[PDB]
């Protein structure tokens, strides 16, 4: 695979808004995130659509593609980071400068809607991109949870690439929709003990592919959707969906023979899942859809819309140990 | 194509709930729909999940598939009609009895989420199915709009298959969210603002349905292949402009706009333009990035009332100069 140079303290991070204009609509959280990374010693380059709005998005399809491409063209930038998601990143894909991305590999990072870019770029270039922090939701989060997110971000992106990396497990997490865009918290978020579950036994090792599952529907079937292959580990998360929607997306995967190919599934914690009074969790729905197909599942990985959030390279091998209840990166993912 | 026998007054219609359990949650409107069709002379057979609930759905995946299959097996039924949509019809697809459908073709009709079944059945069997009335939303509608819906339903499904059929244009329509399952007053009525963007005449096989729903079968063996020359028919309901851009770009990435000869946009019920004042056609235009595809914007085959009935998988001719749309290929035996 094509690998970017590793991150280091003092590097320059460029940010872009490929969908929702949250540098305007969540400006307090944006400023908090900017200050957080600056105090860690990073230099920031603001994408050209920062501070702009086109109603539901930051700019036209072409303006958004231009904003991203301009960061790729900047030799001083080591990391290109999403400000926030939305719905509309998939629009950009015909207009990204893939040749320039190949010529100038950088760490591309974000989550949620930005999945369209992470997966699309991998499909076109083979670049290992990252499911991880977006500036506003991730680094604008109030303490204490933001520090745990940051610890994973800096560890994954700066560590020496020798030997496997085994993920730490956040001690507590939350998914509450409070404390979004103000100077002070209303009150502390509920902190839950980590209830991640490892359904299966033994160890499964395979290339991880996926991201935000609802977002994948916007690139599905196209040359920008990476082919899923026998032995892959499927990584999927969603946010604030109804159980009806979750069944639909799981069945979509089933119809596409995904569950005939993959050797394990990682479900990211689902932020504020709406079970419609059924008390069912997404794993129970997945089990019905699987119709007896036995696939080991890591239910509740902290790489999703919940806080804190871990950083995950996409398109390289991971090993899930279902007996020892851990998950590791086993393949080099930065130069 | 595989063709079902035409409907006749007095026939038996069977109904099924492949997703939302609205025979329970919209029981008043359900009863209105049943009574409406019975008054027309139809006999109704209730699918086995009628009156059942499993929270957000009518029953398990397998039970819903069985409900549908049992209607296929019933020799007295000539038309299998959806009660209502939802989100979850795509789950049934591995379990439908496609061989039984081939052995005894029937009129299968519905819309919205039921698109997964209409498209899936066509992909597997070649059966010409219908984007049209579902029992609860369509036939539980109060007069006067329900009468225009019914006129299209009965005309399309009972007419002799001789010569082209040219659609009537409803004089007025509504998308107002009142009088669902309760009336205090009639819905607000709007003049028909359907628009024909293009020139000349385009003829090609129509394919599509509810666009959001298509995402749940996309890429699979149940998604019919879109071919050079097809007319793409798509409608959505109560979506944000952000979602509409996403779905249009999905089509673009899949090279759909390199294949289609025209696009039909169904009227979008209560579209949320996020203050932009933009309509879906304008968003489509941006996404098309210069591609000159003629568009019929605002066809009355969607979640708005009244609703026309449309066979999927047969040739239509859109005459952009004369501002009309016709079915040009035989669609019932």
Determine which of A21, A95, A124, A255 to mutate to test the interface with B (most B C-beta atoms within 10 Å).
Answer: A255
* Phi-psi sector, A86: left (phi>0), alpha (psi -120 to 50), beta: left
Q: What are phi and psi of B131, to 5 degrees?
A: -85, 110
CA distance A299 to B91: 22
Determine which of B220, B247, B277, B285 to mutate to test the interface with A (most A C-beta atoms within 10 Å).
Answer: B220
Superfamily of domain A165-335: LD-carboxypeptidase A C-terminal domain-like (3.50.30.60)
* Whether B203 is catalytic: no
Residue B32 CA, distance from chain mean position: 20
Q: Is A132 exposed, middle or buried (0-12, 13-18, 19+ CB in 10 A)?
A: buried
Q: Is B133 helix (H, G, I), strand (E, B) or coil?
A: coil
Q: Which residues of B touch A254 (CB under 8 A)?
A: 91, 94
Q: Among candidates B259, B187, B250, B172, which has minimal Cα distance to B214?
A: B250
What's the token pair of residue A75?
């030799």
| Residue of chain A nearest B286, judged by CA positions | A61
CA distance A11 to A117: 23
CA distance A143 to A153: 15
User: Quick check: B209 and B241 in contact, CB under 8 A?
Assistant: no
Please identify which residue in the block is written with the tokens 């946009």. B265
Gaps after residue numbers in chain A (C–N over 2.5 angstroms): none
Determine which of A221, A258, A285 to mutate to test the interface with B (most B C-beta atoms within 10 Å).
Answer: A221
Strand order of the β-sheet with A12-16 is: A43-46, A12-16, A77-82, A107-110, A129-131, A312-314
Q: Among candidates A11, A328, A326, which has minimal Cα distance to A157?
A: A11
Distances A174 to A131, A143, A145, A204, A305 between C-alpha atoms, Å? 19, 12, 9, 28, 10
Say whether B87 and A291 touch across the interface (CB within 8 A).
no
What's the token pair of residue B143?
């007069």
Residue B180 CA, distance from chain mean position: 19
CA distance B230 to B232: 6
Residue B248: its H or E element: helix B241-253
CB atoms within 10 A of CB A272: 12
Superfamily of domain A1-164: Murein tetrapeptidase LD-carboxypeptidase, N-terminal domain (3.40.50.10740)
Strands (E) across chain A are located at 12-16, 43-46, 77-82, 107-110, 129-131, 165-166, 172-173, 192-193, 197-199, 203-212, 233-237, 264-268, 297-301, 312-314, 317-321, 326-329
Q: What are phi and psi of A328, to 5 degrees?
A: -130, 150
CA distance A323 to A177: 34
List B203's β-bridge partners, or say none: B317
Q: Is A242 helix (H, G, I), strand (E, B) or coil?
A: strand
Q: Among candidates B302, B294, B287, B283, which has minimal Cα distance to B321?
A: B294
Strands (E) across A10-61 are located at 12-16, 43-46
CA distance B20 to A247: 13
Q: What are phi and psi of A165, to 5 degrees?
A: -110, 120
CA distance A49 to B295: 32
Dihedral sign for Cα atoms in the order B66, B68, B72, B74: positive
Q: What are phi and psi of A188, to 5 degrees?
A: -65, 145
Quoted resolution (Å): 1.5
CA distance A106 to A127: 9
Nearest-Cα distance to chain A for B183, in Å, is 29
Please identify which residue in the block is written with the tokens 């459908």. B101
Going by DSSP bridges, is the β-strand pair A107-110/A43-46 parallel, antiparallel, or unpaired?
unpaired
Distances B167 to B307, B308, B318, B327, B328 between C-alpha atoms, Å? 12, 8, 10, 8, 11
- Given the residues B235, B237, B268, B269, select the one marked as catalytic: B235
Distances B28 to A22, A31, B34, B108 between C-alpha atoms, Å? 44, 52, 10, 24
CA distance A328 to A196: 15
| Residue of chain B nearest A57, judged by CA positions | B242
Beta carbon pairs, A and B, within 8 Å = 130
CA distance B145 to B307: 9
Please identify which residue in the block is written with the tokens 């670049």. A127
Say whether B57 and A247 touch across the interface (CB within 8 A).
yes
| Residue of chain A nearest B285, judged by CA positions | A61
Q: Among candidates A124, A112, A134, which has minimal Cα distance to A222?
A: A124
CA distance A159 to A168: 14
Q: Which residues of A touch B254 (CB under 8 A)?
A: 221-222
- Extents of the domains making up chain B: 1-164, 165-333
* Whether B235 is catalytic: yes
Please state which architecture CATH assigns to domain B165-333: 3-Layer(bba) Sandwich (3.50)
Q: Which residues of B touch A242 (CB under 8 A)?
A: 56, 87
Of B60, B218, B289, the CB nearest to A221: B218
* Whether A112 is catalytic: yes
Residue A115 CA, distance from chain mean position: 7
> Helical H runs in B104-259?
115-125, 135-139, 145-158, 211-214, 241-253
Of B54, B60, B219, the CB nearest to A221: B219
Helix (H) and strand (E) counts for chain A? 10, 16
What residues of chain A have any CB closer than 8 angstroms to a CB in chain B? Answer: 19, 54-57, 60-61, 86-88, 90-91, 93-94, 217-225, 242-245, 247-249, 251-252, 254-257, 275-278, 288-289, 291
CA distance A250 to A258: 10
Q: What are phi and psi of A299, to 5 degrees?
A: -95, 110
Per residue in A293-318, is it b (16+ CB within 10 Å) or e — as a string? eebbbbbbbbbbbbbbbbbbbbbbbb
Going by DSSP bridges, is the β-strand pair A197-199/A297-301 parallel, antiparallel, or unpaired?
antiparallel
User: Quick check: A66 and A100 in contact, CB under 8 A?
Assistant: no
Q: Among candidates B289, B251, B268, B210, which has minimal Cα distance to A90?
A: B251
- Given the residues A17, A91, A112, A152, select the one marked as catalytic: A112
Q: Among candidates A120, A101, A294, which has minimal Cα distance to A224?
A: A120
Task: Supply the DSSP symbol for B188.
Answer: P
CA distance B217 to B120: 8
> Prior bond to A144 cis, omega within 30?
yes
Residue B195: its H or E element: strand B195-197
Q: Which residues of A touch B56 (CB under 8 A)?
A: 242-244, 276, 278
CA distance A330 to A107: 19
């Amino acid at each position: 695979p094509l690998l970017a140079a590793p991150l280091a303290v003092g590097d320059t991070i460029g940010f872009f808004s490929s969908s929702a204009p949250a540098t305007v609509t969540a400006k307090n959280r944006f400023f908090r995130g900017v200050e957080f990374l600056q105090r860690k010693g990073f230099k920031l380059v603001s994408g050209k659509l920062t501070g702009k709005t086109d109603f539901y998005r930051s700019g036209t399809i072409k303006e958004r593609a231009q904003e991203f491409n301009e960061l790729v063209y900047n030799p001083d930038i080591t990391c290109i980071m999403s400000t926030i998601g939305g719905d509309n990143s998939n629009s950009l894909l015909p207009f990204l400068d893939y040749d320039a991305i190949i010529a100038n590999p950088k760490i591309i990072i974000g989550y949620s809607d930005t999945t369209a870019l992470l997966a699309g770029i991998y499909a076109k270039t083979g670049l290992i991109t990252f499911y991880g922090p977006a500036l506003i939701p991730s680094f604008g989060e109030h303490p204490p949870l933001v520090d745990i997110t940051y610890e994973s971000f800096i560890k994954i992106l700066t560590r020496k690439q020798s030997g496997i990396y085994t993920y730490t497990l956040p001690e507590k997490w939350s998914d509450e929709s409070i404390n979004w865009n103000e100077n002070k918290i209303l009150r502390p978020k509920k902190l839950y003990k980590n209830n991640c579950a490892f359904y299966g036994s033994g160890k499964v090792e395979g290339r991880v592919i996926g991201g935000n599952l609802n977002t994948l529907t916007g690139i599905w079937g196209s040359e920008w959707m990476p082919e899923i292959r026998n032995g892959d580990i499927l990584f999927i998360e969603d946010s604030r969906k109804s159980i009806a929607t979750v069944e639909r997306l799981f069945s979509m995967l089933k119809l596409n023979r995904v569950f005939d190919k993959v050797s394990a599934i990682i479900l990211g914690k689902h932020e504020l899942f709406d079970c419609a009074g059924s008390k069912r969790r997404p794993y129970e729905v997945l089990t019905e859809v699987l119709d007896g197909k036995q696939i080991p599942v890591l239910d509740g990985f902290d790489c999703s819309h919940t806080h804190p959030m871990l950083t995950l390279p996409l398109g390289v091998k991971l090993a899930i140990d279902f007996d020892n209840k851990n998950i590791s990166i086993t393949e080099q993912y930065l130069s």
